[PDB]
Design an enzyme around this catalytic site. Structure first.
Site, PDB file in Angstrom:
ATOM      1  N   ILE A  21       0.845  -1.086   0.021  1.00 11.72           N
ATOM      2  CA  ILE A  21      -0.120  -0.003  -0.035  1.00 11.72           C
ATOM      3  C   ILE A  21       0.721   1.203   0.157  1.00 11.72           C
ATOM      4  O   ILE A  21       0.675   1.998  -0.927  1.00 11.72           O
ATOM      5  CB  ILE A  21      -1.110  -0.153   1.177  1.00 11.72           C
ATOM      6  CG1 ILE A  21      -2.176  -0.889   0.917  1.00 11.72           C
ATOM      7  CG2 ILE A  21      -1.528   1.533   1.357  1.00 11.72           C
ATOM      8  CD1 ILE A  21      -3.009  -1.033   2.317  1.00 11.72           C
ATOM      9  N   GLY A  22       1.520   1.664   1.139  1.00  4.45           N
ATOM     10  CA  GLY A  22       2.438   2.529   1.196  1.00  4.45           C
ATOM     11  C   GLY A  22       3.877   2.275   1.841  1.00  4.45           C
ATOM     12  O   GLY A  22       4.172   1.597   2.586  1.00  4.45           O
ATOM     13  N   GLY A  24       6.747   4.547   4.311  1.00  2.00           N
ATOM     14  CA  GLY A  24       7.069   5.668   5.338  1.00  2.00           C
ATOM     15  C   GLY A  24       8.627   5.862   5.700  1.00  2.00           C
ATOM     16  O   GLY A  24       9.404   4.951   5.024  1.00  2.00           O
ATOM     17  N   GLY A  27       8.570   3.202   8.476  1.00  2.88           N
ATOM     18  CA  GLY A  27       7.452   1.995   8.380  1.00  2.88           C
ATOM     19  C   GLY A  27       7.028   1.791   7.135  1.00  2.88           C
ATOM     20  O   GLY A  27       7.259   2.836   6.133  1.00  2.88           O
ATOM     21  N   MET A  28       6.465   0.553   7.164  1.00  6.75           N
ATOM     22  CA  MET A  28       5.631   0.312   5.704  1.00  6.75           C
ATOM     23  C   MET A  28       4.271  -0.204   5.848  1.00  6.75           C
ATOM     24  O   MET A  28       4.108  -0.861   6.852  1.00  6.75           O
ATOM     25  CB  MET A  28       6.652  -0.499   4.969  1.00  6.75           C
ATOM     26  CG  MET A  28       5.963  -1.455   3.843  1.00  6.75           C
ATOM     27  SD  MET A  28       6.954  -2.481   2.692  1.00  6.75           S
ATOM     28  CE  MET A  28       5.840  -3.680   2.021  1.00  6.75           C
ATOM     29  N   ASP A 139       0.039  16.390  12.526  1.00  6.86           N
ATOM     30  CA  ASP A 139       0.404  16.271  11.354  1.00  6.86           C
ATOM     31  C   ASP A 139      -0.662  16.060  10.176  1.00  6.86           C
ATOM     32  O   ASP A 139      -0.564  15.152   9.316  1.00  6.86           O
ATOM     33  CB  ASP A 139       1.486  15.089  11.272  1.00  6.86           C
ATOM     34  CG  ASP A 139       2.269  15.066   9.903  1.00  6.86           C
ATOM     35  OD1 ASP A 139       2.504  15.961   9.466  1.00  6.86           O
ATOM     36  OD2 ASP A 139       2.753  14.046   9.485  1.00  6.86           O
TER      37      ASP A 139
END
Ligand SMILES: COCCN1CCc2c(cc(-c3ccnc(Nc4ccnn4C)n3)n2C)C1=O
EC number: 2.7.11.24
Length: 338
Positions: A21-22, A24, A27-28, A139
């Site tokens: 998905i994405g 970071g 992190g993932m 954020d």
């Protein structure tokens, strides 16, 4: 051990059939099937242990979301980790899967006013809960707002979240900040550490503006350039606005600038609902003390169709170190899910 993009995810066997998905900074995030609940979910692999800051952010995030329970805030379904501190190299956060996020959406889709109104309502609804818990997200941005095919919205990514600290908010001119530049309140660049609720409201105003045009309203290319963009639309701060800025470097910088006129909201957004522009003005107020508060925003005429104080719940229990010790605290917080 299924691997996504060269990253191994030790989430078996409950979680199989993985999709990316994405990505970071530390992190993932991937999707995966939940054989125990029979649905696809989202799994966040966090590897913070090599840095103290990343470890601080992980602990705070886990702590907050484990406390929080709200329709407009992503919760934690489960946490996966090794049985021992020694064998724990990564932490896995299981969450409900959402179809997309606002950032992705805005890139290719024009929003109707109805959509803008509903999205905004849900953001503020979630934010009311957060702030009621004496917490600051810090954020807020389109990428941190998840959506589903029925237009349900959930706030995610509490990594930079903190307990509000109004009395310890002052700082000097141009003090380094961590949160996403385009969404930083003007005060961050001048005299604020971002320890007050008003910081989140500014971010919401920026999102609203972005929902109106599909373009970020203040796209600064660097630290001070951000302030320039803000002033470029808001115009020169009033004498009143300036009296709240008592650190001299920040005050003298503003005074050094040529007079700039306010760009009218209706010129920036010619197709926008007038009530939406009114609320936008109140969220994007230069003086953080005059900036509209979350509960005030919810009671704004623009959101009249959805506003219901009885259906906008607040928190029942508001919130009142070397990398290794932080790993220990992370271990303890996650013990419940073993
Ligand atoms: C390491 O990053 C930490 C910060 N961080 C940003 C990336 C992220 C987080 C949670 C999700 C998530 C959660 C649930 N569903 C979704 N879905 C989804 C969104 C877009 N596309 N998709 C499919 N995203 N995402 C994509 C998150 O907390």
């Amino acid at each position: 051990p299924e691997m996504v993009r060269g990253q191994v995810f030790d989430v078996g066997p409950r979680y199989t059939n993985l999709s990316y998905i994405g990505e970071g900074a530390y992190g993932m995030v991937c999707s995966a099937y939940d054989n125990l609940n029979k649905v696809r979910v989202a799994i966040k692999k966090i590897s913070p242990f090599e840095h103290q800051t990343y470890c601080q952010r992980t602990l705070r995030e886990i702590k907050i979301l484990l406390r929080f329970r709200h329709e407009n805030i992503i919760g934690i379904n489960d946490i996966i980790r090794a049985p021992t501190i020694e064998q724990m190299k990564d932490v896995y956060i299981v969450q409900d899967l959402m179809e997309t996020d606002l950032y992705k959406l805005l890139k290719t889709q024009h929003l109707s006013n109805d959509h803008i109104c509903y999205f905004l309502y849900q953001i503020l609804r979630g934010l009311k809960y957060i702030h009621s818990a004496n917490v600051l997200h810090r954020d807020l941005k389109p990428s941190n707002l998840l959506l589903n095919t029925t237009c349900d919205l959930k706030i995610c990514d509490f990594g930079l979240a903190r307990v509000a600290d109004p009395d310890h908010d002052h700082t000097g001119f141009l003090t380094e900040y961590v949160a996403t530049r385009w969404y930083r309140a003007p005060e961050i660049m001048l005299n604020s550490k971002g320890y007050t609720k008003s910081i989140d409201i500014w971010s919401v105003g920026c999102i609203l503006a972005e929902m109106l045009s599909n373009r970020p309203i203040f796209p600064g290319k660097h630290y001070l350039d951000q302030l320039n963009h803000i002033l470029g639309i808001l115009g020169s701060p009033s004498q009143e606005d300036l009296n709240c800025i008592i650190n001299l470097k920040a005050r003298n910088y503003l005074l050094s600038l040529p007079h700039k006129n306010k760009v009218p909201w209706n010129r920036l957004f010619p197709n926008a609902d007038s009530k939406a522009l009114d609320l936008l003005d109140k969220m994007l107020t230069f003086n953080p003390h005059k900036r509209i508060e979350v509960e005030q925003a919810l009671a704004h005429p623009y959101l009249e169709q959805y506003y219901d104080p009885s259906d906008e719940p607040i928190a029942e229990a508001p919130f009142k170190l070397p990398k290794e010790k932080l790993k220990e605290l992370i271990f303890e917080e996650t013990a419940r899910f073993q």
